[PDB]
């Protein structure tokens, strides 16, 4: 065995049905390969290897794939960009993401870190060799991470550096909490339901760990300070509808109120294109009950700078870089060539 870190074009694999109209299947039948039946892992005994989740090329290829899945699937009636405007036909689609696996070609292999407190950047004691990652759902969402993998043992805090306030911090939860979003049978308005008891228990635990990493300082949360609608609220796609939820009450400092927390959301039809660019118009929503249950597995936060001369650290929710989503799922993988 002789290897070195390398960057290569991976290929995706999935268990898409070839006879499906749901668009993640349509896209994976042509873009990916069938997933391997009986797959092999081999533990590399007494091997220690340094991973680094914040510099990892898998994350970038997975972004390009997801970008290109959305551009093929989402059908906005109008697209308006730098002077342009294209009107098209915009039927509604069957939307629900499916697990994707990422796989090395010949001559390369994917190292996977099995050390279960692994924050994402250190050296790793219990390394494995695999041909594919596990099944990652390409769900895009801001503020909260949905339908992801859980932390194995203790809640984990990831960041390229906590002392640099310009770097996103990613909290990976112990134990998931359901978020139930529903537009029922004026018609843009919906809401999400969260069990306040479970959630606050978890949020208390998340502050105790943030306290660990900030020299037992006083931790408080605050609404996002600025930016576009997609980052200042928990945004996401359910069944092709673009939901935007005010999550202010999710971070209620006062009570670290324990019935059900209900967040006000709206289904929007004008959305910014997350290919930077411009905006896209979508058709008004379905009739009947649009309903999505999702595990909350992670949160993306930003620490407020200044405040060295103080006794408190303040955090605000916010995504914006969809790539950190991917990082929260690929932090244990690294591609090498033999």
């Amino acid at each position: 065995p002789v290897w070195k870190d390398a960057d290569t074009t991976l290929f995706c694999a999935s268990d898409a049905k070839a006879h499906e109209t749901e668009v993640h299947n349509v896209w994976a039948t042509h873009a990916c390969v069938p997933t391997d039946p009986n797959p092999q892992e081999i533990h590399l005994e007494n091997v220690t290897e340094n991973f680094n989740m914040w510099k990892n090329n898998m994350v970038e290829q997975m972004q390009e794939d997801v970008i290109s899945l959305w551009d093929q699937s989402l059908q906005p009636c109008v697209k308006l960009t730098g002077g342009s405007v294209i009107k098209q036909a915009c039927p509604k689609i069957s939307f629900d993401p499916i697990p994707i696996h990422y796989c090395t070609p010949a001559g390369y292999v994917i190292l996977k870190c099995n050390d279960k407190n692994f924050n994402g950047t250190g050296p790793c004691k219990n390394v494995s060799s695999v041909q594919c990652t596990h099944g990652i759902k390409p769900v895009v969402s801001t503020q909260l991470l949905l339908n992801g993998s859980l932390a194995e043992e203790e809640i984990i805090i990831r960041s390229e550096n906590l002392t640099n306030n310009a770097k996103t911090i990613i909290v990976h939860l112990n134990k998931s909490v359901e978020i139930n979003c529903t537009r029922p049978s004026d018609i843009r308005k919906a809401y999400c339901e969260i069990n306040g008891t479970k959630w606050n228990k978890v949020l208390k635990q998340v502050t105790e760990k943030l306290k660990e990493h900030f020299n037992n300082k006083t931790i408080i949360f605050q609404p996002p300070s600025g930016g576009d609608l997609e980052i200042t609220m928990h945004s996401f796609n359910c069944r092709g509808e673009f939901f935007y939820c005010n999550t202010t009450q999710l971070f209620n400092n006062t009570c670290i109120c324990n019935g059900t927390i209900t967040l006000p959301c709206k289904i929007k039809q004008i959305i910014n294109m997350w290919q930077g660019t411009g905006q896209a118009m979508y058709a008004p929503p379905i009739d009947g009950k649009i309903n999505c249950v999702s595990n909350i597995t992670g949160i993306l936060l930003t620490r407020d700078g200044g405040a060295n001369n103080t006794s408190n650290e303040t955090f605000r929710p916010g995504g914006g870089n969809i790539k950190d989503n991917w990082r929260s799922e690929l932090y244990k993988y690294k591609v090498v060539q033999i």
Binding site: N161, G226, G276, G278, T302, D304, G306, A307, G319, G320
Partner: protein
């Protein structure tokens, strides 16, 4: 690669102002932008940063509510807003691109903020407007270790005042300082003459101050005691 900032602006107490930074030569949408402030005589202060991709921001507690940063990605332009202008806010404001932070591929590999590309700065001057001609006062000479005497020109607006000595015939060792803008939004300036001590009681010195904005001409003789 370059940042082109907007020209200098003048405002009164209260009010708001907006100053822009126009990127060119590079992909504005990657890379974070910080703003920075320098008051006259002080060092730079950090005002916050703004990720032009999603518009996310981060301001130190002393400036949240007083500063806001925004952008327009279609023209690749950053914007800084200073609300509730006080005389403290008179300063030089700088926008800068940090190649170490941002979305997309070309982060530069520096753990510190890589404050790479700087604009030239925009001057925000807070002058409580109105007018007000100045009052002129003698800096009288008193206590080899020769003589210096002069003129204090206090509380006027706007610039400028002209100062001269003996209606322009004295030019030897005279030096009129720049005006300084005080807490009151009014300017003040001083002018001096080094003279040989053997000339007090025999050579005579007059301040000639002229402020045309308010029709004011004063002649103030400086006597020692």
């Amino acid at each position: 690669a370059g940042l082109m900032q907007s020209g200098a602006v003048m405002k009164n107490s209260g009010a708001s102002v907006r100053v822009s930074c126009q990127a060119d030569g590079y992909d504005f949408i990657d890379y974070v932008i910080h703003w920075f402030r320098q008051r006259r005589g002080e060092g730079l202060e950090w005002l916050g940063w703004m990720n032009p991709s999603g518009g996310g921001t981060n301001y130190p507690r002393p400036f949240q509510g007083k500063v806001t940063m925004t952008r327009d990605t279609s023209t690749e332009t950053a914007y800084l807003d200073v609300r509730g202008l006080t005389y403290d806010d008179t300063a030089v404001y700088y926008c800068v691109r940090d190649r170490a932070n941002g979305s997309g591929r070309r982060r530069f590999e520096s753990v510190n903020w890589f404050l790479d590309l700087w604009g030239r700065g925009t001057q925000i001057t807070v002058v409580s407007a109105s007018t007000k001609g100045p009052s002129v006062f003698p800096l009288a000479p008193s206590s080899g270790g020769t003589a210096a005497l002069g003129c204090l020109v206090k509380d006027y607006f706007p610039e400028p005042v002209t100062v001269s000595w003996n209606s322009g015939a004295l030019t030897s060792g005279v030096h009129t300082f720049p005006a300084v803008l005080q807490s009151s939004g009014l300017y003040s300036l001083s002018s001096v003459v080094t003279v040989p001590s053997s000339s007090l009681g025999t050579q005579t010195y007059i301040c000639n101050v002229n402020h045309k904005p308010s029709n004011t001409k004063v002649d103030k003789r400086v006597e020692p005691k």
